[PDB]
Amino acid sequence: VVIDPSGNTYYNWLFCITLPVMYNWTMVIARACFDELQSDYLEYWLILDYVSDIVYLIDMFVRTRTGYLEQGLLVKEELKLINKYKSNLQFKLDVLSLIPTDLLYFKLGWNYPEIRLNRLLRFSRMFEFFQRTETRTNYPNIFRISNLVMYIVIIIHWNACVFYSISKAIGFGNDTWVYPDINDPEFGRLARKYVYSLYWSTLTLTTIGETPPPVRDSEYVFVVVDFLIGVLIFATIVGNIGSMISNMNAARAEFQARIDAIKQYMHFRNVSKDMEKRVIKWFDYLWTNKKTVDEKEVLKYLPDKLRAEIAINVHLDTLKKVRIFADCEAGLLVELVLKLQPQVYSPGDYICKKGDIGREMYIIKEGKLAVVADDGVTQFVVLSDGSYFGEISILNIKGSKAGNRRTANIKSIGYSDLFCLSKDDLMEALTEYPDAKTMLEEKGKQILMK
Amino acid sequence: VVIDPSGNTYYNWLFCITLPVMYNWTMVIARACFDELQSDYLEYWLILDYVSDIVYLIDMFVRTRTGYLEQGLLVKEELKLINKYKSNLQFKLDVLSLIPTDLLYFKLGWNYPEIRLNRLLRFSRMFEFFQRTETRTNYPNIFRISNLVMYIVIIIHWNACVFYSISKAIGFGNDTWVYPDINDPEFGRLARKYVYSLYWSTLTLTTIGETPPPVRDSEYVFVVVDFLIGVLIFATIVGNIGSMISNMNAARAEFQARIDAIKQYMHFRNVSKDMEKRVIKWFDYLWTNKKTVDEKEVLKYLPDKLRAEIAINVHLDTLKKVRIFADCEAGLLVELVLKLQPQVYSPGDYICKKGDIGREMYIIKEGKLAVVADDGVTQFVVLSDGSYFGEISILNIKGSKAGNRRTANIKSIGYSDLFCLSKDDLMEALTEYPDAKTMLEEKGKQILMK
Amino acid sequence: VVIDPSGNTYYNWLFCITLPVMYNWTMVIARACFDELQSDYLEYWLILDYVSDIVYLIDMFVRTRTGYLEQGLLVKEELKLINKYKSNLQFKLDVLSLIPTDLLYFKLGWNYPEIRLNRLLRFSRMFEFFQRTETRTNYPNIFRISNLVMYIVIIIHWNACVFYSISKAIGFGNDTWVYPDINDPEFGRLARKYVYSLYWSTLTLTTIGETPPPVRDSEYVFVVVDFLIGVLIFATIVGNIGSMISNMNAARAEFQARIDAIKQYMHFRNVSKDMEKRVIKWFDYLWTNKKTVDEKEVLKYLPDKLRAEIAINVHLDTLKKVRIFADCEAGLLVELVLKLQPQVYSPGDYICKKGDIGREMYIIKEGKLAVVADDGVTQFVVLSDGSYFGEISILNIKGSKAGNRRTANIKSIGYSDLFCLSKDDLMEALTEYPDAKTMLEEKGKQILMK
Amino acid sequence: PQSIDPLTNLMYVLWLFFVVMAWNWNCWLIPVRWAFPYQTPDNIHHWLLMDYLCDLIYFLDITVFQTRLQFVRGGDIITDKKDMRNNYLKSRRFKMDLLSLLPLDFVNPLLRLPRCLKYMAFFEFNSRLESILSKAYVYRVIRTTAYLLYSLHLNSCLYYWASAYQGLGSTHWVYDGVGNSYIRCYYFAVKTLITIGGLPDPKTLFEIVFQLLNYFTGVFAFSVMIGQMRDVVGAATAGQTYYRSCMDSTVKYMNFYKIPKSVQNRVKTWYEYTWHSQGMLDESELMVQLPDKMRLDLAIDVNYNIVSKVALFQGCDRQMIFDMLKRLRSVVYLPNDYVCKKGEIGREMYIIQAGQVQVLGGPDGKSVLVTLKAGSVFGEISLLAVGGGNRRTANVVAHGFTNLFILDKKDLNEILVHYPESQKLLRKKARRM
Ligand SMILES: COc1ccc([C@H]2Sc3ccccc3N(CCN(C)C)C(=O)[C@H]2OC(C)=O)cc1
Ligand SMILES: Nc1nc2c(ncn2[C@@H]2O[C@@H]3COP(=O)(O)O[C@H]3[C@H]2O)c(=O)[nH]1
Ligand SMILES: Nc1nc2c(ncn2[C@@H]2O[C@@H]3COP(=O)(O)O[C@H]3[C@H]2O)c(=O)[nH]1
Ligand SMILES: Nc1nc2c(ncn2[C@@H]2O[C@@H]3COP(=O)(O)O[C@H]3[C@H]2O)c(=O)[nH]1
Ligand SMILES: Nc1nc2c(ncn2[C@@H]2O[C@@H]3COP(=O)(O)O[C@H]3[C@H]2O)c(=O)[nH]1
């Protein structure tokens, strides 16, 4: 056996069925409208059509052997898979796409390859493969842009075929609007036929004009309808490509808009030039060091399990040095790694001051910190990455000199990333884990007595 | 070494390397496609190319001397900077850009400037400048529009060069689509060559048309591809420019949408004419003094510290007039300003009512406020800017009657800007400083007894 | 005075000064470029220029009598207003606007009316009026389209004048691109001259094309530059139009997305079909009566004192019918409406159930609510508009037969919308007024005793 | 019948569609008969018959369809031939309908120009169509397409009037008179309102003024058209775009920090399963948008009986049950995820909405000693213990994708402090067990 839809085998077969579906959606109408294309390379079209039909049969075989998800579990029962497949409209589409219409080659002739237009009814495999591709690829916006570009290309190709077939129905060279006479040596070439039809289709679907104006009323109707198709469908896909490119830089535009609003605020309230320069320095640091994105807003939809595993994988090295994690009973970390919030401090920021209410605990992701003196010029000791502090004032402690107030002032030399840990979150994690509470109380006592 | 990226010297060098990168991105393809441009100014192009290569070498030196942020601190070790820069893709792009391909002139001749196309590979430096300028320029929408207009000019000029080169490869004057024969006196001029190619490229990239139709298959194919380029990439840039121009007044867009929603509520709800006029007057005052957008929403994307001294800097002139802080220890304002909430009051609005519970400090930023008698007609002395009122109720004292209530009522003579500060925030600010606490207490008791 | 800027007199004078500024900004360049326009109506242009200059003098007099808000109060001092005006850049722009350049006529002749181009420097007044209009119009998007169309027409008119000036400098009729020969009777018509120039400028500044191609190099340069300006103009038009479309359809798209999300939630879950129908009908009732937006998230921007009396004026008929509100004092009604919450109810929601602890007491502002028994069909009493229930569960009586629980069941009839007051908010308002804290208890005791 | 509900009657939607077709006939055919010479006396009776049929539709709507439309003024008023009709007569709809039915006989089609003023019926029919018809962006595409078609229709009629005003074929700009007049004037309207160009250039002053105004209106109408289609596609694909944006931001976050492909594949699998099944990334954002009664009732109709089935919550007050139903957090689990671990402490109760879980035990694990289907509840004993002194007896895996509800500790405590009677009930239940 049973093919899993989320596996690589199913995606590989999605590509292997998208190739004949793209081949049909281009070349069936290409050969139907351009008769010379069908007649000149008819052996190649026969081989490719037979291969595409074989792949269509194997695709219907796969659809009887692909497992659906019933109550969250993959179904391996072959009868259930076959019944599910045949109950869907996809089975009807596959049967309609694989009715053998090539027997009409023996009735209508070899120059009528539109008889296998029903092979276009495998478009759902194309769309399923494109939905599955953008999930797997590392450049989903680029792939979406290319897919919409492809849609533009196939719509232009279809309109080129329709223009050539309409010129054929009216007659080649009867007036200036239609494609010229085939007996012309330059305009009788198959390459010139398709390429000039593509040129007309591109100029009309982009609403440019610059083509011979219509003469007959049917040509006027078709030109009006094609310009309308180029204004409501083609311009829509062009705007969709523009919207995908806008969605590429959605976070970039949001960050820049926030910067611009802050700068407008500083411009109106007559903020001093030094403070404006240092705000710009903070934002330049934010963009340069790639800290413009917050893991809280990006991962807010993810569960606690997946956010926990991602945050352990991101913060493995910095949480290794922390004493309460991986040295104590070590079941605490999963409860706290969700609860840690990242904060960034500029050089010279005073993260806590003596006599200030300590409602939060800091774990140094990175950055040099310093337990400074009262004036701040003298540094007692430098805290490195992985160090944790602020634990003395966040908890009630026996023999507390001050209580609920910071005992030392710590300033960051250089920038610093810290895991802020609020008092309520720490108490939530520590009321259920007494060993970590005892260890943290002992650590707090060791510095507080000194 | 060491060059700080956040410094102004780094930005100046970003400009000084952006100039030769733009010079290359224009003139290399311009001289590659227009042979007369290279031939007629060969010595000037040689001097400018040597200058650009020298600036590229100095940019490589700056990149070796540019300090990166490791563990929060700036790296000043020379070998660390060499090994950091030498391990990036930027070093490979700089080496490939400064490959001395000019030795190819002797081999391929003086008519092949496209061997200097590798000098385009410094483009990221250019982009870095556009990231650094846009962050720091006081007119970011104007710079963004100018940057995308410059991108339009680059793409149009490149397509002009491509059109001229394709006409050269096909043959000048061979058919009606290509550039005309360059032995003609009018069209053989270099200025005419460039400006007609630029006119053709402007017409084609804007999907105007109005150019001679193609004759050859390759010409039709190139016109299809270039119209597709002009409707995808060029029109995406057009849509981005239109989105930025329509959103230059982003704060005005939000405020005007707010006015429109509130006025739709008024008109659908059929509120009275007098108060509709009152709300219109309030929002007229909000726009006239440009007090529309709130500082919390704009500044909430900054750290707590940065907002703290931003609020120090903005209100400093009226914070120094405050009796509570900046007079006793000059450190209480550093302790707590961000808890103050600015609120604007209309003329005649009663800030406090007689004998009610008070939970706000109400520090006056601006406006004239009057203590009123109970009748409402006769008013006592008018409070000035920087004064404080309402501190009797927020902090109660034992032994004093009606301490929790309001001693008097306050009327706004005009539009008053006040700092509403919660009572718990005042306790948190005043537990650290007892001298300011008792200084407030003495005057509060004095005005409370009588 | 002294003229208040927020008054309607200032807006009327803004229109009365905008008319000469628009007249200058269009007709000065119109007469400077079209010589027959200046020559044929020279007396009318002299009269209109003198009138515009007189209105400019009166406008500078107005800015000496336009008060500004310092300390929230309008300045009535004449000398202070004069110094405030003269310190502004607008005084310099107005003085430069009214430098008498008509004397240069006697040096230059009457065919040079560009000498009074400095009258354009009053442009800010023009902008200000439209700014004020966008704040005070009842049709904001109609005026936005009018403003955009007006600005594009001024730019197109200016470029038409520029095109005619370029045709004049090159010489009329020397090639196919310039305006044709003035000596020709058809082309020499002043209306034909201006209208064809405007047609050419509309074509070029909207990137339509359809103009004779340039012949000279300077013409090619100007057409490329003007098509780039037209790219900017068309992008501005498209962006403003699309932003208006988004602004008009924002509420529809958001509430339709809410409908789609709740539909997807109900289909994914196993919600019964009756509750699905009730949900869709309730949302449809909310949109049909156009009361989807809650009054908490729409009134939160304008201040609280304005918000309370907005709630008074909006729901005056409902609040006047309440036993609690406007009984004798009619003073609690102003305060309580802000903290009061709105909740809508489908028919048969069972707002209150017997055996449930009361969280809030409910104020019927609209709809008829019955007091049903356990059977759900028999109605004991129907509560009219402005009524109330839920009093005795959250209020405490020393002698109570119910242990903090609701005693009655209320079933909603006919799409009822009603107000709610929470229990903690009930105590907050209960500590305010003693008449309420005795009246609610004596009203609830009689209901509780039976 | 005698009194229909305009909000939810399909027959009223059909009649409103008929009124829409009559109004569309008037709007689309007044400029045709005004400009084009298609109202010759040979077939003038057809035009008069269809005009009088549309006027009869207008009269039927204004008399026997709009009068019997029930409304609400705090209650449903279905008073047949009473103030239900009077509300319609006091409404602006009746004023617009009577102003739109102005009789002008005097055969100029512009005298029927009041008939275009019955546009409120069109908007009412549209508003019914975003309600009763799912996938409503298709009708919005059709509506903006019809707006563009009508704009080109008006421009074609204006162009034919301009051509006949100057004489057909007098200039290369005007319509020459060869072939179908409407089709070629519509061709001019398409080449103009889309600003395609390519037309013969205007010569006389009237032609240049017409072409200038038509290009200006064309630029603005093309901008309106492209903005409308952009808005329709952006609103129709808003959920898909938001899901793709969140998923790609998550994916680039993992690729930034070099998350291994196993965890990345698990997160992508969660994203695709949540989007395909739930239709949204977080149901809680939808629930907080709703009124409180709707959210509470949806929690009821989802899992009220399933919650009430457990014996621990039996005997407690129903309002605590309502509150915990409001506080249940629905989360899906990938296959072979450890919902419970033996060493991990117990904090939360699991209520399987869908899927199967397996309790492992015995020698070295890997033995399904009991499997629980949808609707089961496990982990409730952890709710009883206070102070964190609870642990899972055995590890529980999710055999497949299991959507299940969470009632964690300090939330059950947060609603226990609201109900002291239930506090005593759960205290004695914890002491018994
Ligand atoms: C039908 O498919 C299309 C989809 C997109 C477009 C682009 S090309 C362009 C490029 C630069 C400036 C302007 C444009 N123009 C006007 C072109 N002049 C001749 C009027 C547009 O319309 C563009 O669209 C937008 C909404 O920016 C064209 C066709
Ligand atoms: N008082 C004190 N604190 C220290 C020292 N070294 C590190 N710290 C940390 O600095 C922190 C400041 O805030 P807390 O008082 O909460 O907790 C303090 C300790 O975690 C030290 O030598 N003395
Ligand atoms: N009663 C009184 N209050 C004053 C006077 N001057 C300033 N105030 C302030 O007005 C405030 C009104 O509210 P409070 O009674 O809380 O506190 C009062 C004082 O802070 C005064 O002269 N008399
Ligand atoms: N028990 C009872 N309640 C009534 C009656 N009429 C109105 N009510 C209201 O219905 C409310 C239900 O909730 P409460 O018991 O708190 O308070 C009740 C009263 O406010 C009545 O006749 N009997
Ligand atoms: N250990 C164990 N758990 C079971 C069994 N049957 C059902 N369970 C459930 O599996 C759950 C695992 O976590 P808990 O210990 O909290 O609660 C347990 C029960 O709810 C069983 O036979 N043994």
Question: Read out DSSP for D8-35?
Answer: S-HHHHHHHHHHHHHHHHHHHHHHHHHH
- With beta carbons under 8 A apart, name residues in chain A contacting D354: 71-72
Mutate: best of D149, D151, D183, partner A, most A CBs <10 A? D183
Instruction: Say how far residue A12 (Cα) sits from the centre of its chain.
Output: 20
Token pair recorded at residue D35: 């400009």
- Is there a contact between A100 and A57 (Cβ–Cβ < 8 Å)? no
Domain membership flag for residue D222: no
Any residues with CB less than 8 A from the CB of A394 and at least 6 apart, and which?
A358, A359, A360, A361, A423, A426
B288·C5 Cβ contact <8 A: yes
- Tell me how far apart the alpha carbons of residues B275 and B273 are, in angstroms, rounded to a whole number: 6
Give the phi and the psi of residue D319 in degrees, each rounded to 5: -75, -35
List, in order, residues 6 or more apart from C333 with CB less than 8 Å away: C312, C319, C325, C326
Among candidate residues A38, A60, A8, the one with its CA nearest the CA of residue A168: A38
Q: CA C421 to CA C327: how far, in whole Å?
A: 18
The sheet with strand C409-413 has its strands ordered as: C379-383, C368-372, C409-413
C-alpha to C-alpha distance for A21 and A15, rounded to whole angstroms: 10
CA distance A198 to A160: 5
d(CA A120, CA A30): 13
Distance, in Å, from the CA atom of A120 to the CA atom of A96, rounded to the nearest integer, reads: 10
Domain extent for D25: 1-133
Sheet of B363-366, strand order: B341-345, B416-420, B363-366
Tokens of C444: 């609830």
Q: Locate the ligand 4 atom nearest the alpha carbon of residue C389 and give its number.
A: 20
- Residue among D352, D340, D357, D358 at smallest CA distance from D310: D352
CA atoms within 13 A on the CB side of A339: 18
Within a 10 A sphere around the Cβ of A58, how many other Cβ atoms?
13
D399 and D303 belong to one structural domain: yes
Q: Which residues line ligand 1 (CB under 6 A)?
A: A 206-207, 230-231, 234-235, 238; B 206-208, 230-231, 234-235, 238-239; C 207-208, 231, 234, 238; D 195, 226
Q: Is A239 in the B-facing interface, judged by CB distances under 8 Å?
A: yes
Q: How far apart are CA A159 and CA A166, in angstroms?
A: 10
| CA atoms lying within 13 Å on the CB side of residue C423 | 13
Q: Which amino acid is at D306?
A: I
CA–CA separation, A238 vs A231, rounded Å?
A: 10
Spatial distance between the Cα atoms of C23 and C40, rounded to a whole number of angstroms: 17
CA distances from B262 to B257, C135, C298, C299, C419 (A): 9, 12, 7, 8, 21
Q: 3-class SS at C444?
A: helix
Which helix (H) or strand (E) segment holds residue D377: the answer is strand D377-378
- Do D275 and D307 share a structural domain? no
Phi, then psi, of C413 in degrees rounded to 5: -125, 130
Q: Single out the residue of D367, D366, D356, D359 nearest to residue D333, CA to CA.
A: D356
Rg (CA), chain D: 34
Tokens of A64: 């009887």
Nearest CA in chain A to B234: A242
Retrieve residue D25's tokens. 């006939």
Chain A CA closest to residue B238: A242
The H-or-E segment that residue D332 falls in is strand D329-333
* Whole-angstrom distance, CA of residue D140 vs CA of residue D147: 10
Q: Give the pair of three-digit tokens for residue B402.
A: 């009606």
Give the type of residue at C31.
R
Q: End-to-end CA distance of chain D, in Å?
A: 64
Among the bound ligands, the one closest to the CA of C233: 1
Alpha helices (H) along D309-362 = 318-327
D60 & D120 share domain: yes
Chain D interface disruption, residue of C153, C208, C419, most D CBs within 10 A? C208
What are the binding residues of A for 3',5'-cyclic GMP?
390, 393, 406-407
Which stretches within A66-180 are classed as H helix?
Answer: 78-87, 89-97, 123-136, 140-170
Task: Give the residue from D99, D133, D167 where a domain finishes.
Answer: D133
The subunits that touch chain B, with at least 3 C-beta pairs less than 8 Å apart, are A, C, D
Q: Which amino acid is at A210?
A: E
Residue (of D324, D315, D319) closest to D429 by Cα position:
D315
Q: Tokens for D312? A: 């621990």
A223, amino acid identity: V
Provide the 8-state DSSP code for C303: -
- Give alpha helix (H) positions in A171-209: 190-205
Cα separation, C80 vs C83, in Å, equals 5
Q: Which residues line ligand 5 (CB under 6 A)?
A: D 340, 346, 359, 369-370, 378-379, 381-382, 392-394, 396
| Ramachandran angles phi, psi of D35, nearest 5° | -95, -60
D149-181 burial by CB neighbour count: b if 16+ within 10 A, else e?
eebbbbbbbbbbbbbbebeeeebebbbeeeeeb
- C361 has which bridge partners? C421
CA atoms within 13 A on the CB side of C68: 13
Contact B168, B193 (CB under 8 A): no
Give CA–CA dist B13/B129, Å, rounded. 9
Q: How many angstroms does the Cα of residue B207 sit away from the middle of ligand 1?
A: 6
Q: DSSP letter at C367? A: S
Q: How far is the CA of B407 from the centre of ligand 3 (A)?
A: 6
d(CA B429, CA C3): 45
- A165: amino acid identity, one letter: S
| Residue for token pair 């060493």 | D343
Mark whether D119 and D249 lie in a shared domain: no
Residues 6 or more apart in contact with residue D432 via CB below 8 angstroms? none
**What CA–CA distance (Å, rounded) separates B196 from A259?**
42
Of B360, B332, B338, whose CA–CA distance to B430 is shortest? B332
Contacts of residue C159, Cβ cutoff 8 Å, sequence gap at least 6: C201, C204, C205, C226, C229
* CA atoms of A126 and A132, how far apart (whole Å): 10
CA separation for the pair A116, A105 (Å, rounded): 10
For ligand 4, is residue C427 a contact (CB within 6 Å)? no
Query: Residue A419 in contact with residue A347, Cβ under 8 Å?
Result: no
> A345 - beta bridge partners?
A416
Neighbours of C393 (CB within 10 A): 23
Please choose from A159, A204, A207, A225 the residue to mutate so as to test ligand 1's pocket, defined by most ligand atoms within 8 A of CB: A207
Residue B409 DSSP SS3: strand
Determination technique for this PDB entry?
Answer: cryo-EM
Give the chains touching A; criterion: ≥3 Cβ pairs < 8 Å. Answer: B, D
Q: Is residue D210 part of a domain?
A: no
DSSP state of D348: E
CA–CA gap between residue B345 and residue C233 (Å, rounded): 42
Q: Which residues are paired to D407 by β-bridges?
A: D349
Write out the two tokens for B64.
Answer: 């070796």
Phi, psi at residue B168, to the nearest 5°?
A: -65, -45
Q: Are C81 and C65 in contact (CB under 8 A)?
A: yes
Query: Residue for token digits 């609201």?
Result: D418
B418 sits in which H/E element: strand B416-420
The span from the CA of B123 to the CA of B130, in Å, is 11
Q: Is A391 helix (H, G, I), strand (E, B) or coil?
A: coil
Helix, strand, coil content of chain A in percent (nearest 5): 60, 10, 30
Mutate to test the pocket of ligand 3, among B447, B448, B449, B450 (most ligand atoms within 8 A of CB): B447
Q: In D278-380, where does DSSP find H-type helix?
A: 283-289, 292-308, 318-327
Resolution expressed in Å:
2.9
Q: Nearest 10 degrees: CA dihedral of B267, B268, B269, B275?
A: -10
Give the structural domain span for A307.
Answer: 296-449
How far is CA D153 from each of CA A214, D51, D60, D174, D229, rounded to the nearest angstrom? 19, 19, 28, 17, 19
Return d(Cα B81, Cα B101) in angstroms, integer: 28
C6 contacts B284? CB cut-off 8 A: yes
Residue A416 CA to its chain's centroid (Å): 31
On the 0-12 / 13-18 / 19+ scale of CB atoms within 10 A, A164 is: buried
Instruction: Retrieve residue D84's tokens.
Output: 């239900």
CA quadruple A6, A12, A15, A20: dihedral sign: negative
Judged on CB neighbours under 10 Å (0-12, 13-18, 19+), C439 is: middle
Closest approach atom of ligand 1 to CA B239 = 27
Q: Sign (positive/negative) of CA torsion B29, B33, B37, B43? A: positive
Contact D116, D51 (CB under 8 A): no
For residue A353, give the CATH number of its domain.
2.60.120.10
C-alpha torsion angle, residues C233, C238, C239, C245 (rounded to 10) = 150
In angstroms, the Cα distances linking A22 to A18, A52, A125, A156, D75 are 6, 10, 10, 14, 59
State whether the Cα torsion D293-D295-D296-D297 is positive or negative: positive
User: For C137-213, where are the alpha helices, taking DSSP H only?
Assistant: 140-170, 190-205
- The whole-angstrom separation of Cα C211 and Cα D277 is 57
- Report the alpha-carbon distance of residue C337 to residue C318 in Å, rounded: 12
Contact C318, C385 (CB under 8 A): yes
Residues D12 and D99 placed together within one structural domain of the fold:
yes
Residue D156: phi and psi, rounded to 5, are -65, -40
B409 CA distance to ligand 3 middle (Å)? 7
Residue A42 burial (10 A CB sphere; 0-12, 13-18, 19+):
middle
Chain C hits for B247, Cβ within 8 Å: 239, 243
Q: Where are the beta strands (DSSP E) in A29-158?
A: 69-70, 73-74
Which neighbouring-strand residues pair with A422?
A360
Distance CA D342, CA D364 (A): 12
Provide the angle, in degrees to the nearest 10, between the axes of the packed helices C217-268 and C190-205.
50
Asked if residue B238 lies in contact with residue C231, where contact means CB atoms within 8 angstroms, the answer is yes
Q: Smallest Cα–Cα separation from B14: which of B132, B97, B96, B150?
A: B132
Instruction: Report how far residue C375's alpha carbon sits from residue A151's, in angstroms, rounded to the nearest whole number.
Output: 62
User: b/e map of D53-68 (b: 16 or more CB within 10 Å)?
Assistant: ebbebbeebbeebbbb
The answer to whether D41 and D163 have CB atoms below 8 angstroms apart is no
E strand or H helix that includes residue B225 = helix B217-246
Sign of CA dihedral B4, B9, B10, B11: positive
SS3 call for A390 = coil
φ/ψ (deg, to 5) at D397: -105, 160
Q: Collapsing DSSP states into helix, strand and coil, what is residue B328? A: coil
D369 CA → ligand 5 middle, Å: 10
Sheet containing B409-412: order of strands: B350-352, B409-412, B369-372, B379-383
Q: What share of chain D is helix, strand, coil (3-state, %, to 5)?
A: 60, 10, 30
Tell which of D133, D165, D196 closes a domain. D133
State whether D361 and D390 are in the same domain: yes
**Is the same domain home to D260 and D316?**
no
Q: Which amino acid, B401? A: K
Which of A30, A36, A41 lies closest to A183 in space, CA to CA?
Answer: A36
Please give the distance of CA C427 from its chain centroid, rounded to a whole number.
39
Integer angstrom CA distances of residue C76 from C4, C59, C64, C65: 10, 18, 11, 8
- Measured CA distances, A223 to A201, C100, D183 (Å): 10, 59, 10
| Annotated binding-site ranges of C for 3',5'-cyclic AMP | 406-407
D92 touches chain B (CB under 8 A): no
Virtual CA dihedral for B64, B67, B69, B72, nearest 10 degrees?
150
Alpha-carbon gap, residue A141 to D204, rounded angstroms? 51
Distance of CA C91 to the CA centre of its chain: 30
User: Dihedrals φ, ψ of D148, to 5°?
Assistant: -65, -40
Q: Are B183 and B193 in contact (CB under 8 A)?
A: no
Distance CA D246, CA D211 (A): 48
Distance, CA of A445 to CA of B331 (rounded, Å): 30
- Give the residue from D102, D133, D164 where a domain finishes: D133
Which residue's alpha carbon is at the smallest distance from atom 6 of ligand 2?
A: A371
**Residue among B248, A329, B102 nearest D388 (CA):** A329
Task: Examine the domain organization and report whether D258 and D306 are in the same domain.
Answer: no
Q: How far is CA B133 from CA A270, B6, C232, C424, in A?
A: 21, 12, 22, 53
* DSSP 8-state secondary structure symbol assigned to residue D177: S
Rounded distance between C-alpha atoms, residue D363 and residue C379, angstroms? 65
* Residue at B268: amino acid letter: F
Task: List CB contacts of A112: < 8 A, sequence separation 6 or more.
Answer: A32, A104, A105
Structural element, H or E, at residue A10 = helix A8-33
Ligand 5 centroid, distance to D126 Cα (angstroms): 56
Q: What are phi and psi of B235, to 5 degrees?
A: -75, -30
Residue C3: closest CA among C53, C78, C55: C78
* 8-state DSSP, C121: G
Closest-CA distance of chain B to residue A90, Å: 34
